[PDB]
Amino acid sequence: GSGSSARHMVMQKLLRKQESTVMVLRNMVDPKDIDDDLEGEVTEECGKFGAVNRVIIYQEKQGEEEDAEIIVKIFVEFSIASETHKAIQALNGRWFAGRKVVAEVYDQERFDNSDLSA
């Protein structure tokens, strides 16, 4: 005890494997901003934080109505969780023009299932 299991890295590799590598950026851009370049722009930018596996842009309806508002959610899956956390530290809480940036870890299992609703 008193640090011996940690010195032997006990269960670290499994814990690491279970860490999500997915970041979600919530309501950072508006629907008009989504063009054939956005995914690429986000990919390139996030290379300042890590190796990027893929990016998904999702226009989520808030309500069931024809005119329900949309919230844009941008998902960035990094190669390793440490990268995800560097990105979040650099992005979360910033002002993007007049929008405060919300950058958070997104559940890996949801993401892997294409459940982009949380």
Curated annotation (Swiss-Prot):
Lineage top rank: taxon: Eukaryota
Residues in cross-link Glycyl lysine isopeptide (Lys-Gly) (interchain with G-Cter in SUMO2): K17
Cystine residue pairs: none
Tissue expression remark: Isoform 2 is expressed in colonic epithelium and colorectal epithelium cancer (at protein level). Isoform 6 is expressed in colorectal epithelial cancer but below detection level in colonic epithelium. Expressed in heart, brain, placenta, lung, liver, skeletal muscle, kidney, pancreas, spleen, thymus, prostate, testis, ovary, small intestine, colon and peripheral blood leukocytes.
Residues that bear N6-acetyllysine: K13
Ranges for domain RRM: 21-108
Localization per record: Nucleus
Note: Does not repress TFIIH-mediated transcription in xeroderma pigmentosum complementation group B (XPB) cells.
Entry's free-text remark on domains: The third RNA recognition motif, called PUMP domain, is atypical and may rather mediate homodimerization and/or protein-protein interactions.
Family named by the database record: Belongs to the RRM half pint family.
Subunit structure, interactors included: Homodimer. Associates with the spliceosome. Found in a complex with RO60 and Y5 RNA. Found in a complex with FUBP1 and far upstream element (FUSE) DNA segment. Interacts directly with ERCC3. Interacts with CDK7 and GTF2H1. Interacts with SRSF11/P54. Does not interact with ERCC3 in xeroderma pigmentosum complementation group B (XPB) cells. Interacts with ARGLU1; interaction may be involved in ARGLU1-mediated modulation of alternative splicing.
Function: DNA- and RNA-binding protein, involved in several nuclear processes such as pre-mRNA splicing, apoptosis and transcription regulation. In association with FUBP1 regulates MYC transcription at the P2 promoter through the core-TFIIH basal transcription factor. Acts as a transcriptional repressor through the core-TFIIH basal transcription factor. Represses FUBP1-induced transcriptional activation but not basal transcription. Decreases ERCC3 helicase activity. Does not repress TFIIH-mediated transcription in xeroderma pigmentosum complementation group B (XPB) cells.
UniProt disease link: Verheij syndrome: A syndrome characterized by growth retardation, delayed psychomotor development, dysmorphic facial features, and skeletal, mainly vertebral, abnormalities. Additional variable features may include coloboma, renal defects, and cardiac defects.
Protein name: Poly(U)-binding-splicing factor PUF60
Species of provenance: Homo sapiens
Portion of the full sequence shown: 443 to 559 of 559
